[model samples]
Target: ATPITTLQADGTHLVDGYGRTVLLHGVNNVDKDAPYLPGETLTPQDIDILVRHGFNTVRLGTSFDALMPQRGQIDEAYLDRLTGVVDALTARGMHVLLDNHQDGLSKAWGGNGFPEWAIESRPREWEPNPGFPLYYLMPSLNAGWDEVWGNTHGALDHLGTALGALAERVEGKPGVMGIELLNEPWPGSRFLSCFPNGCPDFDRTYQAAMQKLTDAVRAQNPTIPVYWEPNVTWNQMMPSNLFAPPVTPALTTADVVFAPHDYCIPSQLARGLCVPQQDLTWSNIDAITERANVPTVITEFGDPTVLKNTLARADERFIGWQYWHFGAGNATDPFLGEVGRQLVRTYPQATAGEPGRMIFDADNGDFAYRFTPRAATRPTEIFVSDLHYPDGYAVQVDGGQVTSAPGARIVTVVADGSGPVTVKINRPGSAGAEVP
Candidate 1:
């Protein structure tokens, strides 16, 4: 089992157990907005394909309603299947982030976050979101949020207890890196208080619940990394500032990862220069991270052109990313094939001490990166995809002893802390470099 990953002191990068930095790349295997189980959505061969694509992590989605089918009652089957998926991914040197995903809150409320029995609501006419994501514009969802936050049916404590059990389920599992705690939290009927400016009570309630949830998880896995998301409105990606700045919540714990999803909405989603759109979205997120003093890992983002563009920004910003909706029938998708070559890139997995600028020519198959070596105890690892260099490849390095491992597709290099080292991998069959 590989070492656990944690947010570094700089609050910008994630480091492995040996304290070397890790740049996570993968996708979000979210079930179609409903109560779903693990393992069924994917097969073992899929895992092998993802690993072969040069992915290091997967943001595995879990449903609150499914896990806690009955009020305060934990479903053993669901947990077991979830554990199996976690083990499957981790067993192959991959990390899994358990996301407590919810859409409108629940099927009764909107989509699927909480079980039906738990949600308490007031009578109100409702309409579904016009789009596929099924956003919140209904009174049912708002009322549902109110009840859950208010603990109207004693479900709040029950949810917390169940989450604690969740943390315990994968406490010592090396493949499990962290828990998302909550997915996109939708603000209740007080929608007006959220937009334009900001809302204090909403922020307070949100943070307090997160604090409680964090405490619950820490009770079982104190040291495991736990991630938190912001109010759903922030994802609007509108013309105005994403928010009017409030007292952003802090986990008050050492190991935490600030995860945010970016869509760039109509801008990138429309036919336009997606790079600029992503730049705007990620720029706002960067501000939040700087303010919170925590690192960020984008749990979701997807589009054919936009996916590649966003990940490019992620690499430059020292942030990690996991794309969304990598579901079945999405076989050897053209988009994933692009990701396999461009986004499933060569990155410095671990550095001897600190890593410097690392860049790869995905379009041309050239990688050159620099890293500073440490005590030479553990070597730095870089993933080289065979898919990109199907025919063959070559590696040249300076200031270190490098070993080429063929089967694993990982290049391991040891640095003696003597000086800075540079690695260059010349790969053929990339774009115009392809052979007949």
Candidate 2:
């Protein structure tokens, strides 16, 4: 497999290496480094599961500390694990993106990703409520929080050094695609503002920090795409004030792609409990991409099961999306198990089964959906797989019929349309169907 090279302008991605457009359908294997458990290794079985599900890529979401131990120091053990995973994915003909994911600098704050030291030395006031806190609570975990001011500055240097090391290590590795700087940087105090919400005046500072990291990585490998997320939370619906401006033009290189998390609805909804309905609208999604002036990927979405309309909406907007998680917990705690139980209680039984797969198990709902390209110039293709009901499947793109083999593990649909074209899938009598 050739390295995933991209000539697209900044904030854009190469659909297909040559000229053909491709879709990246995959799941976020969050627990890839969970303590100890069976199937912990990046085994061929995991790759088989992903390929069977029609996933062309895997988001290797590793914490900042996990990737770069102390600043310039790269953990050999961690790198070995990471390399093995990338090798496995490559062997399985899958693309891999190294995501330096962090929420509050480690799971110590009850979130994963990021090193504990990055947060421990920060000011106590920056810490949010130990329990449930919004993205902007006190002692904020964002890069701009006052308490972690030093950490923020140090992190920039640390990230730059680590990415440089990564580039060297993966010098000729075809499986490793690129790096995602940070998950969701909530750097201010205003919890309820729109995008670029926190540290209103320090927008340039955040952009500069991101640029430093991007530049550091590029210095080593300039061909692969480097992805970035917006400030505050990943939710596009959040107000514009909550998000920072796109990386400055000087820092915007051709290999950078703006991939943000599109979690329109609240997480609670998965448990069948609805929060005060905010504007769960598509306009927000449209605005974020338009403002960023970059092609965006819904890096993460979905719950125990994707709601029929929710999944359809996601398909219609973003170029690609990854379900929130793949496996449950590592060996000790089953994070997804707790989530599944909550989902089972909150929503109807129809939406159970593998939380990652999209399909209504209880209700006989049409699982087929379509993703219309937001840009006219960028023709799109869709890949559907992991269908429990393989025999009973049919797809129509722009009113043209597309065929799929019986028990076909994955279905790829390539279509052309000016704007948003409808792609529908008929599950017939099956109870569950996944789009990713």
Top TM-score prediction, candidate number: 1
Off by over 4 Å in 1: 1-10, 32-41, 122-135, 197-201, 238-251, 267-271, 328-336, 405-408, 428-436
Prediction 1 TM-score vs. true: 0.87
What does the lDDT read for residue 435 in candidate 1? 12
Task: At residue 241, give the lDDT of candidate 1.
Answer: 22
Cα RMSD for predicted model 1: 4.3
What local lDDT score does residue 326 receive in model 1, on the 0 to 100 scale?
A: 74
- Per-candidate TM equals 0.87, 0.69
* Each model's lDDT: 0.70, 0.51
lDDT of 2 at 34: 58
In model 2, state the lDDT of residue 433: 44
lDDT: worst 10-residue window of model 1: 427-436
